[PDB]
């Protein structure tokens, strides 16, 4: 039924984002200096990636395991995820990753106040570049998923879940740690409501917007007929 694809992403996001700051988290927690001085990144870019693969299997059977408004947006010009359909979607969708933050919450303390679980620039990375950055990021992950939905030279196989999970994954390795891979409306502001709050909470909302349209200009256009 309709509804049910609503809760479901609604879970769905809720359990991902959980995951994702629960690995990147967890290197940080027991007496600072020892292991996590500052963390070993690919533990954490396979946990993002990794987790997308595995909900898209369980919930993905039904709703469509999206878990990021800007994926839907970009499937809204080209996939028609139909004018109601993505706005109740992105709703479940936004909402969910905030259920997750605030769980989160109840652990430990140590630095409030700068960077604990949300995104952001660190030193020389002007907004402008932090911008072209998720805009390529996110385009990088729409390519993948519009590209899923059609026939490809030896078709995929099977591992659909695992392609769009690994295109995760490289879009995470090249910006997880650039950009703190935003390319998802929802990881950024689930951290963003729980803090509350920054003015440079444009760029990683914006980037995955701009960049997924982008991406479909080119596919639908010149990589599609």
Same mark, same amino acid.
């Given at each position: 039924? #309709?509804?049910?694809?609503?809760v479901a ?15 990147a988290l967890?290197?940080?927690?027991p007496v600072?200096n020892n292991?996590?001085a500052?963390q ?9 990636g990794?987790?997308?693969a595995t ?7 039904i709703?469509?395991a999206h ?7 970009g499937?809204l010009?080209?996939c028609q995820i ?7 979607y ?6 969910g990753? =905030?259920?997750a933050?605030?769980?989160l919450?109840?652990?430990?303390s140590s630095?409030?106040?700068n960077?604990?679980g ?17 805009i =390529? ?9 519009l590209?899923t939905t059609?026939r ?8 659909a879940?695992?392609?769009?999970g ?8 090249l910006?997880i ?8 409306p929802?990881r950024? #502001?689930?951290?963003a409501v729980?803090?509350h709050?920054?003015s440079?909470?444009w760029?990683?909302?914006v980037?995955?917007?701009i960049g997924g349209a ?6 639908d256009?010149?990589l599609?007929p």
């Amino acid at each position: 039924l #309709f509804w049910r694809a609503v809760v479901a992403e609604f879970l769905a996001t809720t359990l991902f984002v959980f995951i994702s700051i629960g690995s990147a988290l967890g290197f940080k927690y027991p007496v600072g200096n020892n292991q996590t001085a500052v963390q070993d990144n690919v533990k954490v870019s396979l946990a993002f990636g990794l987790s997308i693969a595995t909900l898209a299997q369980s919930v993905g059977h039904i709703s469509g395991a999206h878990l990021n408004p800007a994926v839907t947006l970009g499937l809204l010009l080209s996939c028609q995820i139909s004018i109601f359909r993505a706005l109740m979607y992105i709703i479940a969708q936004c909402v969910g990753a =905030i259920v997750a933050t605030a769980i989160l919450s109840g652990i430990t303390s140590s630095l409030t106040g700068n960077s604990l679980g949300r995104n952001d620039l660190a030193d020389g990375v002007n907004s402008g570049q932090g911008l072209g950055i998720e805009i =390529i990021g996110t385009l990088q992950l729409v390519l993948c998923v519009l590209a899923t939905t059609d026939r490809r030279r030896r078709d995929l196989g099977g591992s659909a879940p695992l392609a769009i999970g690994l295109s995760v994954a490289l879009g995470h390795l090249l910006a997880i740690d650039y950009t703190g891979c935003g390319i998802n409306p929802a990881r950024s #502001f689930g951290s963003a409501v729980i803090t509350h709050n920054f003015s440079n909470h444009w760029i990683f909302w914006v980037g995955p917007f701009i960049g997924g349209a982008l991406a479909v200009l080119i596919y639908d256009f010149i990589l599609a007929p």
